[PDB]
């Protein structure tokens, strides 16, 4: 048992009736002094270290060559000038076991935290030494955290793709299904999560070439995708992860959900494929009135109307489909389907729930397409256009496949530094650079949509940590007030940076003219409503920072109308799973799951108290399972009104909650504007 592990395990040894939280600083100090300083490869100077790293195929020389060595040395000195110290053992452990560069034999540490931050900043700056120093200050202050792919792989020759979220539209044809399998394997090989929309595939029992009862439905394609994701396991260290989304009005919806039942037969079970369901307002209306609903065979609709079922407005087309004899449909119980969804989410946490009308009533790019499905983390909500993959020697009709590179603001550190605007703009610039440097060679629609849309995802983390470290209950009205003001400011400054980038580069995203940004319909609520804090306590937290007013939003609206917007999508709140430890921040905007996180690494167990946890703020670090999920829904809906994409929203349920409680939580989320529901976690 190592000394640092012994010190960390002393956290739970209560002394004087209170946890010994100070043992974590001792634990991290001992961890460093006894493992990291010993196992760190020694270089005489930065020049020798950089030459060794570049020569040994560690660092790409393309990005480093853009700077004179004096500039690189200055950036590295800027990174080390802060004297950054990890405040807890878990943060340093996570960094030096997941992200710190290690020799090919994985026995020595080539990168410190400062070295990794400096390399990432140099990669971001793209030759701008002052920009690189600004990035170094942003990341060393831990105001902005690049996503795990960008942070880990940036500047590395062996690096994989800096983007990790991929959404693919699958067309209803064998050629398209084969291409989807190939692209899913190609993207998983790169380590990115791949989400597929199966709503266009015809249901089981549909005809292929005037041959009836030939189609196998979406479950056969799901088995193919599950096998493909299992094969492309990314060395096996992280098993291949894929998500399939199906509209609730698809015929195969019941079979689609049955793949996640434990009682399901093994020939139907899909082990490695997450499933999400897209629920239009029509289904909720049908269940509310207890009316009998119908699930439609997609190919009959496509033949009758020449357009896909999921390409149409179900709230306008459901009655026409029901009344159309040429459309094939079978009756279902919408309330029975909702209860089945709740039961499945309780048993396995699946499927993800996407409220299509909640997403598309605020979607700015409905002209390009409506948001038909989400990603593997349930927070990516963008317009997609399906591709037409034809026969060999036939030209393909490449559509738009969704992808975004992620970054997270550290709310606590952004508020402590009073640098919301600067942090947001620098994060937007870094995300734009990552997007511009991405080129996927086996996903034509992904690459085309990356070039055309320039979609980025700027999330946030440490909301609960910041609130608890400030004497604010997560469920309290003041917490929602702060979230409203902060995320309104984030949206304002991200829109301002997008417009400024469009002005500087002279280009907007493809089909920007038809977006709600161009027509000004996006800014209606911001020019009509004031989002300043309504509580004095919350308003004081923003002291020293300028909170945009309706006049500021009017000016920004005029500026956007003049110059346009560079990004079709800017904000999405991803889970931010493992990089939160490095930042010593709570995960995303969700409430903390546990006050002290007990985990076993190797054969020694480690304890991770929530950042800033102490006796004074112990009660404010309320666990999610003890929280009223209605208040969590209220907070997420408050945040979501300023996020153009979705928010990964996990439901934390007690074992005593029935399926009716889960159904009520989902119905309240739909009522409150929640776009997606990620997971049903039960204590």
């Amino acid at each position: 048992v190592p000394k640092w592990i012994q010190l960390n395990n002393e956290i739970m040894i209560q002394k004087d009736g209170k946890f010994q939280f100070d043992k974590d600083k001792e634990a991290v100090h001992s961890y460093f002094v006894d493992y990291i300083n010993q196992n760190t490869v020694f270089f005489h100077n930065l020049k020798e270290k950089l030459d060794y790293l570049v020569e040994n195929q560690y660092y790409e020389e393309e990005f480093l060559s853009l700077y004179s060595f004096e500039d690189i040395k200055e950036v590295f000195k800027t990174a080390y000038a802060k004297k950054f110290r990890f405040p807890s053992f878990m943060s340093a452990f996570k960094f030096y076991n997941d992200y710190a560069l290690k020799t090919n034999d994985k026995k020595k540490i080539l990168e410190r935290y400062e070295d990794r931050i400096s390399i990432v900043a140099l990669f971001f700056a793209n030759g701008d030494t002052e920009k690189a120093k600004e990035y170094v200050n942003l990341m060393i202050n831990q105001e902005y955290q690049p996503s795990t792919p960008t942070f880990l792989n940036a500047g590395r020759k062996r690096r994989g793709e800096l983007v990790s979220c991929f959404l693919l539209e699958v067309n209803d044809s064998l050629n398209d299904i084969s291409r989807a399998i190939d692209i899913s394997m190609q993207l998983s090989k790169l380590g990115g999560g791949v989400s597929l929309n199966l709503s266009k595939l015809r249901a089981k029992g549909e005809a292929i070439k005037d041959v009836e009862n030939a189609t196998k439905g979406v479950v056969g394609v799901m088995k193919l995708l599950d096998n493909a994701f299992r094969y492309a396991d990314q060395m096996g260290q992280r098993q291949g992860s894929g998500a399939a989304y199906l509209n609730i009005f698809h015929r195969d919806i019941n079979d689609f959900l049955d793949t996640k039942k434990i009682s399901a037969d093994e020939d139907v079970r899909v082990k490695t494929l997450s499933i999400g369901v897209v629920i239009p307002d029509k289904f909720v209306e049908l269940a509310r009135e207890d009316k009998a609903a119908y699930v439609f065979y997609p190919h009959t609709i496509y033949k009758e109307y020449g357009q896909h079922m999921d390409e149409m407005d179900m709230n306008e087309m459901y009655d026409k489909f029901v009344d159309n004899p040429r459309v094939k449909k079978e009756k279902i119980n919408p309330r029975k389907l909702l209860e089945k969804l709740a039961m499945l989410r309780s048993e396995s946490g699946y499927p993800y729930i996407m409220f299509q009308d909640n997403v598309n009533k605020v979607h700015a790019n409905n002209h390009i397409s409506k948001v038909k499905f989400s990603n593997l983390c349930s927070e990516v909500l963008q317009a997609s256009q399906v591709s037409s993959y034809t026969d060999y020697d036939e030209e393909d009709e490449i559509g738009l496949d969704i992808s975004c590179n992620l970054g997270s603001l550290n709310i606590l550190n952004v508020m402590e530094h009073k640098s919301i605007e600067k942090t947001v703009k620098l994060a937007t610039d870094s995300l734009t650079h990552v997007s511009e440097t991405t080129d996927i060679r086996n996903a034509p629609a992904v690459r085309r949509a990356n070039k055309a849309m320039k979609s980025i995802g700027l999330g946030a983390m440490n909301l609960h940590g910041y609130l608890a470290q400030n004497g604010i209950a997560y469920e309290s009205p003041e917490a929602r007030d702060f979230a409203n003001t902060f995320f309104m400011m984030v949206n304002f400054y991200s829109i301002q940076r997008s417009a400024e980038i469009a002005k500087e580069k002279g280009e907007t995203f493809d089909q920007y003219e038809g977006s709600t940004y161009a027509t000004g319909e996006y800014f209606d609520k911001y020019v009509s409503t004031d989002f300043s804090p309504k509580y004095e306590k919350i308003a004081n937290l923003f002291e020293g920072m300028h909170i945009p007013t309706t006049e500021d939003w009017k000016k920004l609206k005029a500026f956007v109308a003049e110059h346009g917007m560079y990004h079709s999508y800017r904000l999405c709140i991803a889970p931010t799973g493992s990089i939160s430890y490095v930042q010593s921040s709570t995960a995303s905007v969700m409430p903390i799951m546990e006050r002290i996180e007990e985990r076993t690494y190797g054969n020694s167990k480690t304890y991770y108290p929530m950042p800033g946890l102490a006796s004074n703020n112990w009660f404010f670090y309320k666990e999610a399972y003890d929280m009223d999920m209605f208040k969590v829904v209220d907070m997420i809906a408050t945040i979501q009104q300023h996020i153009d994409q979705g928010i990964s929203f996990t439901l934390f349920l007690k074992d005593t909650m029935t399926t009716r409680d889960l159904n009520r939580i989902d119905l309240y989320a739909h009522h409150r504007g929640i776009k997606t529901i990620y997971y049903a976690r039960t204590k």
Partner: protein, 287 residues
């Protein structure tokens, strides 16, 4: 007053050997001397034989003659445990630790071992002597069954417990502890049924039944001594095991409502260390 609680206890104790992974014992087994491995195999083989007959014959035959559907359900469950769970678990242990030839040899050894054949002859003879509607023949078989459950298994149980208590063969030991936990409740239950029959008798008849029980115990005991020496002399433990079987003989007598017969002795402390869905209503869609 008791069958329902025994029913609940028996069904809540349900287990299968496959729940316990045995590959963890591979090294502590490899490390034992040839004498130790030999005694261990033979001990478990003797146990397998006892459970084979308790499951095939003893429990089903007692079930047949005992009145009441709930009493029969408990006895049927106990019978299933004997041959479908207990006897089979020993083969799981054998198949993990030993090569096929050693397994074949130990089963051949049970067939030719005179003490194991004698104890089977005596116990099964009493089971097969039960006469319909004859409560005395039934009592005699229940005494035999209690002696099998609470006394005879223990010359065998000693050794897995002795190792478990030293932190050796702990996965096999976990199986054995589950078997022992079952036999303890089986011995109590059958003991209570035997006492029911005994309590119906005249004082003169009771005196004869005590004579039967004590004579049978002594006869089984003398045979078990020879069996114990035969198995344990090569590992140096015969005297210790003898103390253990006397201890458990007293427990068997107590299960039958009789006073202890052997004086108390200190048992090896190692062996002691070895021991929901609801529907959505209309109001759920409004807030």
């Amino acid at each position: 007053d008791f069958t329902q609680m025994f029913y609940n206890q028996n069904v809540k104790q349900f287990w299968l050997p496959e729940e316990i992974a045995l590959n963890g014992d591979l090294l502590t087994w490899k490390y034992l001397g040839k004498n130790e491995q030999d005694t261990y195999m033979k001990v478990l083989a003797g146990l397998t034989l006892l459970d084979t007959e308790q499951g095939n014959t003893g429990m089903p035959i007692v079930a047949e003659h005992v009145d009441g559907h709930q009493r029969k359900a408990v006895l049927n469950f106990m019978a299933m445990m004997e041959n479908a769970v207990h006897a089979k678990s020993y083969s799981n242990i054998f198949m993990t630790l030993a090569p096929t030839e050693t397994i074949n040899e130990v089963f051949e050894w049970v067939k030719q071992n005179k003490y194991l054949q004698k104890k089977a002859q005596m116990i099964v003879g009493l089971y097969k002597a039960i006469q319909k509607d004859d409560e005395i023949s039934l009592f005699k078989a229940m005494v035999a069954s209690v002696y099998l459950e609470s006394f005879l298994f223990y010359s065998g149980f000693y050794y897995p417990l002795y190792f478990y208590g030293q932190g050796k063969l702990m996965q096999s030991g976990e199986i054995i502890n589950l078997i022992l936990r079952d036999e303890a409740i089986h011995g109590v239950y059958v003991g209570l049924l035997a006492q029911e029959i005994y309590n119906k008798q005249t004082e003169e008849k009771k005196a004869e039944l005590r004579e039967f029980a004590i004579d049978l115990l002594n006869q089984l005991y003398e045979n078990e001594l020879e069996y114990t020496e035969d198995l344990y002399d090569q590992v140096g433990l015969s005297h210790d095991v003898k103390k253990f079987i006397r201890y458990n003989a007293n427990k068997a007598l107590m299960n039958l409502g009789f006073d202890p017969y052997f004086e108390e002795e200190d048992i090896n402390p190692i062996v002691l260390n070895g021991l929901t869905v609801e529907p959505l209503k209309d109001d759920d869609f409004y807030f």
